[PDB]
């Protein structure tokens, strides 16, 4: 499993996606998963889950 | 962001410093600059 992440550039094109290896012995084991994503007003970052 | 550099001469107050910069993309794109120390007095590089 891989998490991929991209964004719009100023000219409306999309950046080449970053990737993060996600598979750790458990998401392979889930069934019907779903992902969550939200920015943070404190400590500007992305909480992905 | 600058990855690595190499200074031209042996006295770091002279010569040029070549830099290798990479981009915040994927794959990365590598760039190069040069900082001419012959335009550097008081640790302040001239903008040119």
Structure tokens at B31: 């760039």
Instruction: State which approach was used to obtain the coordinates.
Output: cryo-EM
Enter the resolution in angstroms. 3.2
Which is it for the CA torsion A22, A25, A28, A33, positive or negative? negative
Residue with tokens 């990365």: B28
Structural element, H or E, at residue B17: strand B16-22
**Beta strand B2-7 pairing with B16-22:** antiparallel
Contact A18 B26 (CB under 8 A): yes
CB under 8 A, 24+ apart: contacts of B7-16: B12/B37, B13/B37, B13/B40, B14/B38
Residue B7, Cβ neighbours under 10 Å: how many? 14
Q: Is A26 exposed, middle or buried (0-12, 13-18, 19+ CB in 10 A)?
A: exposed
- Tokens 């950046």 -> residue: A15
Q: Does B27 touch chain A (CB under 8 A)?
A: yes
Residues in chain A, overall count: 49
CA distance A18 to chain B (A): 6
Contact: A19, B26; criterion CB under 8 Å: yes
**Position of tokens 């069934």?**
A31
């Amino acid at each position: 499993f891989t998490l991929k992440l991209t964004h719009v550039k100023y000219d409306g094109s999309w950046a080449s996606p970053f990737s993060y290896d996600i598979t750790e012995k458990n998401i392979s084991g889930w069934k019907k998963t779903g992902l969550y994503c939200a920015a943070s007003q404190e400590d500007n970052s992305l909480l992905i889950a | 962001k600058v990855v690595s550099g190499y200074h031209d001469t042996v006295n770091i107050n002279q010569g040029n410093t070549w830099f290798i910069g990479t981009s915040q993309t994927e794959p990365k794109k590598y760039y190069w600059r040069k900082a001419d120390h012959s335009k550097c007095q008081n640790g302040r590089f001239a903008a040119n």
